[PDB]
Design a protein around this ligand. Structure first.
Ligand code: LL0
Ligand code: LL0
Ligand code: CA
Ligand code: CA
Lengths: 205, 205
């Protein structure tokens, strides 16, 4: 039974890849929370490679991949040269906003706060780079009244260092996202590979 | 104790990366043995990324990385445009020969047979591409008397489709290497991640 052996082997590889995806998501969340930039970069490279070796995904695995993709776009939020979508006009924070609205998760107060902070910063990052026409195009793509009209007024005046962007800042967006990442870390700390590795480390204490 | 928690977490990540390296080596060996080219390519991408996230290696982990690197160079043996070493003159089969001589393994009859087949084919692949001067430079770097002088005679005559290369062929080299890969597969089939995944698959039968 050479085909039966091959089949059972491929099924075991799929189980192992699932365990590796959860572990890499947990590690990526932790590097983002701790601000360990180089660990985040190396872990993201590993997460992408493992994802390309996975074919069929459960709803839980799709949510895990979206969390990885969301943090990657957020970490690249100021890198306006990075192209995350087939449509080259979409900026990194706009790509993060699309993923945020697709994740099967509760739309609690924190969800809406992170959503609105990414919207403000998607415009703010264009303004800070002197890309005023791009800021207006990002505004049109996002918006699709009171906050909307304040944003359009800021874009038209080219008021880059406007106090509005200091109130709803890039740092405030990152802090709110780190609060959400803390919840993902708590949830995934019990996944198979991390639990088994932690038990090994503890047994040697 | 924020530093103690961080420390135990990094140690658990190192244990998990070790388990992932063994599993990826096993999967890479199997794709090479089965001739599953695309699975080999995707698995190699995952193996490289995991290796860059590992710092301190045990002697066993270094041997595992060398096995991965050796199969990658062998799979690229006919790709003379590929540069595996800082010295751009070194061809892929020459790079595989260097690794073969560095692995902490028994120098049994099969070891020497694979070694000599890689030496012949490192010259053969240059000849087949019409790279006669490169074949002579590869010969000088490798050699570093009876087989040595037959090889130099073949290079000087530009006898690409010589019967000697059909007797000690690229296919014969691949078959001997697959015999060695079967031994590595038997040895690594008992490593943690594959054993646990296989037990999950079996429990669902
Ligand atoms: N390509 S990407 O930068 O959006 C990315 C980042 C982390 C994990 C996966 C991933 O892509 C895809 F592999 F899931
Ligand atoms: N760079 S490479 O093509 O020699 C290679 C292939 C498989 C695994 C690791 C690896 O390099 C290094 F990551 F170990
Ligand atoms: Ca751009
Ligand atoms: Ca070359």
């Amino acid at each position: 039974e050479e085909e039966e052996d091959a089949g059972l082997v491929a099924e075991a590889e799929a189980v192992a890849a699932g365990w590796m995806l959860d572990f890499l998501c947990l590690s990526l969340c932790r590097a983002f929370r701790d601000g360990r930039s180089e660990d985040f970069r190396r872990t993201r490279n590993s997460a992408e490679a493992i994802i390309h070796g996975l074919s069929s995904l459960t709803a839980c695995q799709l949510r895990t991949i979206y969390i990885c993709q969301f943090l990657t776009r957020i970490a690249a939020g100021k890198t306006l040269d990075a192209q995350f979508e087939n449509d080259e006009r979409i900026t990194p924070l706009e790509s993060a906003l699309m993923i945020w609205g697709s994740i099967e998760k509760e739309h609690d107060k924190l969800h809406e706060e992170i959503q609105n902070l990414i919207k403000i910063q998607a415009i703010a990052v264009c303004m800070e780079n002197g890309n005023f026409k791009e800021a207006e195009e990002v505004f049109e793509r996002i918006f699709g009244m009171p906050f909307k009209s304040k944003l359009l007024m800021i874009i038209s005046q080219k008021d880059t260092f406007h106090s509005f962007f200091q109130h709803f800042s890039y740092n405030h967006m990152m802090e709110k996202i780190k609060s959400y990442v803390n919840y993902v870390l708590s949830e995934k700390s019990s996944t198979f590979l991390m639990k088994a590795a932690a038990k090994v480390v503890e047994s040697k204490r």
